[PDB]
Amino acid sequence: GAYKYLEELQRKKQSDVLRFLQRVRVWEYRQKNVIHRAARPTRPDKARRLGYKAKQGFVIYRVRVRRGNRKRPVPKGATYGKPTNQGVNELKYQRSLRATAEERVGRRAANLRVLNSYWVNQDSTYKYFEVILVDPQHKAIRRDARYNWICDPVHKHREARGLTATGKKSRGINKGHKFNNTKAGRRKTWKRQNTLSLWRYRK
Amino acid sequence: PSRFTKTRKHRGHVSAGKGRIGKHRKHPGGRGMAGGQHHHRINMDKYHPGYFGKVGMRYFHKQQAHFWKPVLNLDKLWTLIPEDKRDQYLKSASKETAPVIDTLAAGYGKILGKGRIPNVPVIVKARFVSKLAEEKIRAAGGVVELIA
């Protein structure tokens, strides 16, 4: 199996062979549009372990997003509040840049469903990602019961609700004491412990 | 029952029990525990000594089940034995037939020597015992078996 050799090679990101391909590909992706169709995945071994299959209905898109912090709009820097909320230049945008890349792709190809995404390249200004998309209306995905779950309408815009791999990481949905605040939903957990429960026979 | 309240007796009286000079307002002295160090100090000291400041060491992630140790005095030591069989052990005090009392099953962790027990040999199975609780048990002809 050749996928073991690529998997070990992709971890040597600062080797001479990978950093030359990194500099060549960062130029090529920058000349194209911000969102454009990719004929084939750049990393076949990374895509196929994220759910991608090489048949009709699986679509790969390449998207780049601007790096850095999120500047609060607040025209001329005024916030009109307490000094604790006067920060404008160090807000961090609690959703990851990979999640923003998924959300921009999901609006262009609204007929598809976002499966996963992975990091392909980056520079100072742009971070490049490749997003795996499936076609819920294609008969190859409507059949083949390993993949027909995406066609059921609860999975509409998974990346817009934080249901993807990067979406649940940003929401902090894991197990253990370190995720007590966020393990069943931040707003649902807060509403559960801020609700006054009263019974017919008061306890 | 609102019909037994003093509001019904205050119908017709202008101030409704609040006075004409006091003029009952929203919050004359503050909200909640306001001014515990400025204008309620005479009430904080004198009926709440010790409210401000820290004394002990912090305990991160305290589990109350780690300190589970209910105490059982030598006062009773026999309510754990059913009442039907209690009398037949009291009037037949002798060794080789000593009752075995497992205080752990009853929900106790430590045995304390407060009360006085009859001179009957009693086998006690407990996690912890006091120093003179053991002495009173051994003086009666009993033994304590340490369990976990």
């Binding site: 801020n194 | 409210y51 080789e96 099953a105 086998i123 033994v143 340490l146």
Partner: protein, 193 residues
């Protein structure tokens, strides 16, 4: 605000708590629904016992380690010891927990005996459709209840070997406290010469 001696109260009602008040008026209504749900389920799951058989399990946390409790599943090593496979056991009503192990012989043999008594009390029907019906028993826990083990007996003999039962506790607590420094005493003098 503070007067007229009273315990200091901590009432957490400084938010919009009135928007999140949940009064359980449907306590009688939902109880009927659960009984209705249990009744309509049993007709659909014809005469299966409405619940799976679950093993005997000792609790952790010494506040609760003295008790036995119904567990989740029958601990894959226990299923093989009873003479059946795990995949087959799930279809007969034996819940299986693959992520727990066996390090207690008393618990293991109690669960194996629990599974032996279960296979001797079931009527497995063939796939053909003969159906010699065996009118439902609504609970699999009321048929095989969880029972506390019998640790000791009522009466024994006084065995006084002379350890005072309290110096043992004082010595065991002391030798644990001073264990770490005494292994350094055996290391600071071993390096001599």
């Amino acid at each position: 605000a503070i007067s007229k001696n009273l315990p200091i109260l901590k009432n957490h009602f400084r938010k919009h708590w009135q928007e999140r008040v949940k009064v359980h008026f449907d306590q009688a209504g939902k109880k009927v629904s659960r009984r209705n749900a249990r009744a309509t389920r049993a007709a659909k799951i014809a005469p299966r016992p409405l619940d799976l058989l679950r093993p005997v399990v000792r609790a952790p946390t010494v506040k609760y380690n003295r008790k036995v409790r119904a567990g989740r599943g029958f601990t894959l090593a226990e299923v093989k010891a009873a003479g059946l496979t795990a995949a087959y056991a799930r279809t007969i009503g034996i819940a299986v927990d693959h992520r727990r192990q066996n390090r207690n012989q008393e618990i293991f043999d109690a669960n194996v005996q629990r599974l032996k008594e279960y296979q001797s009390k079931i009527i497995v029907f063939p796939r053909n459709g003969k159906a010699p019906e065996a009118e439902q028993v609504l609970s699999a826990a009321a048929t095989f209840p969880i029972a506390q083990p019998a640790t000791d007996v009522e009466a024994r003999a006084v065995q006084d070997n002379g350890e005072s039962a309290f110096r043992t506790l004082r010595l065991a607590r002391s030798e644990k406290k001073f264990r770490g420094i005494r292994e350094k005493r055996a290391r600071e003098k071993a390096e001599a010469e």
